[PDB]
Amino acid sequence: AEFVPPPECPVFEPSWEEFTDPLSFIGRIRPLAEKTGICKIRPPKDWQPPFACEVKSFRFTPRVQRLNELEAMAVREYTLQSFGEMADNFKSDYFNMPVHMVPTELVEKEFWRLVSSIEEDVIVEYGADISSKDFGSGFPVKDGRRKILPEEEEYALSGWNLNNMPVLEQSKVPWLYVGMCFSSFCWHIEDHWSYSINYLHWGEPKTWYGVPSHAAEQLEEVMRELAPELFESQPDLLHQLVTIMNPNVLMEHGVPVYRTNQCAGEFVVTFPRAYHSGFNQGYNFAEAVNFCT
């Protein structure tokens, strides 16, 4: 049987008034969004920050990802441009059609088939170990390292600029993700059970799955039961390097799971102790940071 898509997580389209303060808005949506673990936030139509990374010098060596590495129980340097050419060529060749014509439901169905396939070994690459300190943030930042036009200053000062989120807990910079088709991140929660906010600067959508915090123990129970026994006794911080699991398996065991396709220009917020995972539909560029309330 083919993959059954989970129900859609909440999507919010705040007015310009509601968009004034992120923490205030997230606090207001909390009664609903914390019951779904993840939610999507569409900024007002005219809110479009520029892309502010140093594209000329952007170079990275992505990690290699074997989709079926659990069921089965190298390095290339790219620029942003050459990675995008590799990514589009991979997807268009795999589906035998232009990249933008591949339905999101098909990539989703094919991704989870490949994760459990023993007869087909598909290998992709993910630019996932990129700090915003290396080549700059995707958002404009008034740090003097790169020019900012007057029309872009409001985005350098915006509270939705991930560089302006509060990160100090009572008793940290954004990270970048250059994705291709089938590149993925497995089930995990954040350190200190922190919130996280994620912005897709451009490219094809990023598909998400989320579990509300009230079902965190249920997920971890299903994991220890079905995860490889060799990795059963591993600490959570190490096990969550390989906590790959089909969302339908969690749903069969009574774990509530919600999905969304995060498109370019949209935010995804993960709530405290909300397990989440996902994959990229194609060539895209995301920025993420953990924040405190």
Ligand SMILES: Cn1ccnc1CCO[C@H](c1cc2nccc(C(=O)O)c2[nH]1)c1ccccc1Cl
């Ligand atoms: C936290 N965590 C757990 C295990 N390892 C880590 C550290 C590297 O975390 C990344 C990661 C976390 C994340 N959260 C939201 C969105 C994305 C995205 O890619 O858009 C994310 N990517 C990661 C974890 C597991 C497997 C692969 C990768 Cl790339």
Ligand SMILES: [Mn+2]
């Ligand atoms: Mn995360």
